[PDB]
């Protein structure tokens, strides 16, 4: 299975965003990209939502490496091109996943298309971290994790209510 990028309805965040405050806001064009699948656990799909990378943020992300997955870009590897938030990662129900389309003209893009093969070069360490932090916060309840990161199962609970609806 491959790493892609992803948006979420604005309809299915709002739902989770009852439950969970932790979620990523959006609507329209404050819309999140998400990237997935870095965890199937098990039924349920996991997407981790991605920022772009000042000196206040960058060290804040540092020292949440538990958590944060650091992007760069491979052929210019002390380049860092954004973070992964493994701590607001969610499940999606297939009906709610919305294929992520590049235009490579946008610069935007372009650097989009980088952080993408960096990913992918770096898959395994992204799942793992995933199920670390997923085991972490909802089955060890250990503190740091817990505080930081979604409530995973009943985000997985109401996923399934959704879409029985």
Not at 4 to 15: C, N, P, Q, S
Not at 56 to 64: C, F, N, Q, S, V
Not at 67 to 89: A, D, K, S
Request: hydrophobic share 35%.
């Amino acid at each position: 299975g491959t790493l892609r990028f992803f948006t979420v309805t604005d309809e299915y965040i709002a739902y989770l965003r009852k439950f969970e405050s932790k979620v990523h806001y959006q609507y329209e064009n404050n819309a999140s990209t998400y990237v997935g699948v870095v965890l199937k656990k098990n039924d349920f799909n996991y997407f981790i939502p991605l920022l772009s990378y000042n000196p206040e943020k960058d060290k804040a992300m540092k020292k949440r490496s538990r958590i944060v997955t650091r992007l760069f870009e491979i052929g210019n590897i002390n380049n860092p091109l954004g973070y992964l938030l493994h701590h607001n990662m969610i499940p999606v129900p297939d009906s709610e996943l919305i294929p992520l389309p590049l235009d490579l003209k946008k610069p935007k893009h372009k650097m989009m298309q980088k952080q993408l093969i960096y990913m992918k070069s770096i898959s395994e360490k992204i799942e793992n971290k995933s199920e670390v932090v997923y085991r972490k916060a909802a089955h060890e309840k250990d503190g740091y994790y817990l505080k930081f990161s979604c409530d995973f199962k009943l985000l997985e609970a109401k996923a399934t209510l959704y879409s029985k609806k």
